[PDB]
Every structure is written in C-alpha cells, then in structure tokens.
Ligand binder design. Structure first.
Ligand SMILES: *Cc1cc2c(cc1C)nc1c(=O)[nH]c(=O)nc-1n2C[C@H](O)[C@H](O)[C@H](O)COP(=O)(O)OP(=O)(O)OC[C@H]1O[C@@H](n2cnc3c(N)ncnc32)[C@H](O)[C@@H]1O
Ligand SMILES: [Cl-]
Length: 385
C-alpha cells in the first residue's frame, strides 16, 4: 500500500548518504537494508576511515574528495555524533619506486593542495615512532584526516529519518522488476514500488546485480585490521601522530593514530582473501596472515606500536578490474542508479557520492564529472545477460 518517490536498496555507506540527500529535499524515500546500519557485516565498520585529498589512486578524484570533505564538515555541525578528526595523512614510499606516492605528489601539485614534502630522517625526526630507510620520501597532507564511519552512517540515518525517510531493516531484497516508468523490489517482508531506484548493496552487488541483467566483474575480498597496544607518547592522536597510507616493497598499508588510548590501527591494503559475502569468515585471526602481515610492517616501520593485539575486525572490499568506482545510471533503465565496486577506497567519498546519487535519481544527471566511474567504460568489462 505504500509507493515511494525513491527506493534505496542497501542503506550503507553510499545508500544512507543518498537517503539523507533525498530526504533533505522532501523526496519520499524508502531505504531497505539486509541488516541494521551501521553494522559489522558490510564494508563500513572498524570505527575509522581515512580521507585524503591529494589522491594517489588518481588525481581525477580530487574534486569529489574536496566536496566530500566539505560535506563532512557540514555533517559535523548538524549532529552530536563525532564525525571527523584532522589528524592529517602521511604518505611515503621508496624514492622513485612508488606510483602511489608519485601520483599523490602530482595530484597535490595539480590542484594546489597544501602539503609538506620530506624524506629520509626528516620523516623519523618529525614523527618519533616512524622508522623508515633513508631512501624513502614522503608527502604529508595536514588538512586530511580521519572519519568515524559508523557515526557518519548513524548520523545520516537519524537526520534522514527525522525528515521522513523510512528505513526497513533486516530485509534482504531478492529481486527487482523494472519498467519504463516505475521500479519494484521484492523482499521476504513484502514488495515496494517507486519512481526511481538506487542500488548500493556493497559486497552483495557482486551477487545480485545479475537480477538487473547486469554482468560486471566484481570481486569481494576479506580485509582485516588490527588495533595494537602502542607507545602513547608517540602514536596518539593527542601528540599528532598522523593517519597514513604507505607503499613498501611488499604492498600498501594504511593506519590510524591511537585515539583515546585504544591503540594504533593497521591494515594491509593490497592483499586479501577472495570470498563470497555470504560465506566469508568474519573472525579475525583464523588465518595466520591476519596478524602476521600486520606485525611484519609494524616491527619494521612503527616498532613502538607492535604491542599486544587489543582488537581485530574483518571487513570487505569489492573490486572492479580498474579499481575505480561504478556510479552511473543503469544502461537499460534511466530510472535505476548503480553504486558499486568502491574497491576498498570509497568511504571518504560517501558524502559526495550521496549527493551524486540523489541528483542522478532525481534528474538523471549530476553536476559532478563522473565519467571516470561510467558503467560503460571498457576497462570495466561490463555487459548485459
Ligand atoms: C573494509 C575496509 C574498507 C575500507 C577501509 C578499511 C577496511 C578494513 N578503510 C577505508 C579508508 O580508510 N578510507 C576510505 O575511503 N575507504 C576505506 N574503506 C572502503 C570503504 O569502507 C568502502 O568502499 C565503503 O564502505 C563502500 O560502501 P558501500 O555502501 O558500497 O558498502 P556498505 O557500506 O557495506 O553498504 C552496503 C549495504 O547494503 C546492504 N545490502 C546488501 N545486500 C542487500 C540486499 N540484498 N538487500 C538489502 N540490503 C542489502 C548491506 O547490509 C550493507 O549495509
Ligand atoms: Cl569497497
């Protein structure tokens, strides 16, 4: 008995931000989620998320990063939940041996971003606790920081619901029926129709997009993080230890300073187990690599933060072949919006993406340049069934 203006399937990082943007405009919105966001079964938990502006994955992301940062500052002012801490973000790697570092530097130059460049011992001297070889160089971004992701989703949800948005929890959408002038979703708890549909199922996009006649290579990965007892006089946010994403011989690692003494948090970015979102083992430590890959980095670069494992978490990345997002209209249905393949680095942009999804759903267009996220790009290898 209840039609909606817009239905959002998957009320996570991207869907809830879209829900907030829609509700803010008086658009009657229904958000449906398999669980109760924020939760620990998707890609948004683990407390913290890094947001960077000079983008090593590609300078073309800068505008969205800057717009997202401003939207995060707006969210901070609207809710009592803590949204962002300006820890700054340090990026480093072997000189001349890191495309990531190199593109971060180019992006900063190209967009006139405020950053400090340093190398070797200067890194170790500036931040006691970091020990890198002398042939390493770095780019520090002081105005970048850390987002409290679960707080963001919770805030976007409270605000959207305050404005009339309805969130149907613990309801897994199983199929879609799309027509030229309306959309319909099917769930065990009933079916619903609307004029527009936004699909942002995270890891499950790799399993249910075929229900929309889409065939896109999307690979879910098991990605763990660990919190370690650390020397608080060095790794605390209070003494300005930064968030970071760095590149060493064996891959990319990212981390956060200890907040309130909860310990430095670390994650290995370039390695993960290919899994299925419905059978993944969410227990940290079941694979020897979970803990060993982290300490391997710590004992070498942040030895004072290699103490007792205080906590672990298991979460998921959903990768595309080129590792760029998919934000576009469904090729066969202009009334359906797709948001997928955030490949492990999309949370920082979720506020910005929420805005883009809203525009796409309401107008079929967006003011942002989102061509690099086109669902029709060749590097994606997309097709219809
Ligand atoms: C896992 C991970 C990711 C990560 C990170 C560290 C780890 C361990 N650190 C990041 C960082 O420092 N900076 C950054 O910018 N990103 C970082 N990430 C990546 C980021 O967290 C992910 O890209 C982001 O969360 C992706 O968002 P998306 O909205 O795609 O995924 P979600 O938040 O999991 O939400 C999906 C929701 O949809 C629901 N769902 C699924 N299937 C259904 C069905 N069938 N019906 C209804 N709802 C469905 C889920 O329940 C989920 O809530
Ligand atoms: Cl992801």
């Amino acid at each position: 008995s209840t039609h909606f203006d817009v239905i959002v399937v998957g009320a996570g990082s991207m869907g809830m931000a879209a829900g907030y943007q829609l509700a803010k405009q008086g658009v009657k919105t229904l958000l449906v989620d398999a669980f109760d966001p924020p939760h620990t079964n998707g890609s948004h938990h683990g407390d913290t998320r890094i947001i960077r502006h000079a983008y090593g994955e590609g300078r073309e992301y800068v505008p969205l990063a800057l717009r997202s940062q401003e939207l995060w500052y707006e969210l901070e002012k609207e809710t009592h939940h803590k949204i962002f801490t300006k820890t700054g973000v340090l990026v480093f790697g072997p000189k001349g041996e890191s495309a990531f570092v190199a593109e971060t530097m180019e992006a900063a130059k190209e967009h006139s971003l405020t950053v400090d460049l340093l190398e070797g011992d200067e890194i170790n001297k500036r931040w006691p606790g970091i020990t890198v070889p002398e042939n390493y160089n770095a780019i520090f971004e002081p105005n970048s920081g850390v987002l409290f992701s679960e707080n963001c989703i919770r805030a976007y949800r409270e605000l959207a619901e305050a404005r009339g948005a309805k969130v149907l929890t613990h309801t897994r959408v199983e199929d879609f029926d799309i027509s030229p002038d309306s959309v319909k979703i099917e769930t065990a708890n009933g079916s619903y129709t609307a004029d527009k549909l936004i699909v942002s199922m995270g890891a499950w996009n790799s399993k249910l997009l075929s229900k929309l006649n889409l065939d896109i290579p999307l690979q879910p990965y098991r990605q763990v993080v660990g919190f370690f007892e650390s020397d608080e006089s060095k790794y605390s946010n209070d003494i300005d230890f930064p968030g970071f994403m760095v590149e060493v011989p064996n891959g990319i690692y990212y981390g956060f300073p200890s907040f309130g003494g909860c310990g430095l948090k670390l994650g290995y970015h370039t390695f993960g187990q290919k899994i299925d979102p419905d059978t993944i083992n969410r227990e940290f430590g079941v694979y020897p690599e979970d803990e060993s890959n982290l300490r391997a980095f710590l004992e070498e670069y942040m030895p004072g933060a290699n103490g007792e494992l205080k906590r672990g978490a298991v979460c998921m990345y959903t990768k595309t072949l080129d590792e760029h997002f998919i934000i576009d209209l469904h090729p066969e249905h202009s009334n359906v919006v797709i948001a997928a393949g955030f490949s492990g680095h999309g949370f920082k942009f979720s506020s910005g993406v929420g805005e883009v999804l809203s525009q796409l759903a309401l107008t079929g267009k967006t003011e942002h340049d989102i061509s690099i996220f086109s669902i029709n790009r060749p590097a994606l290898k997309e097709s219809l069934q």
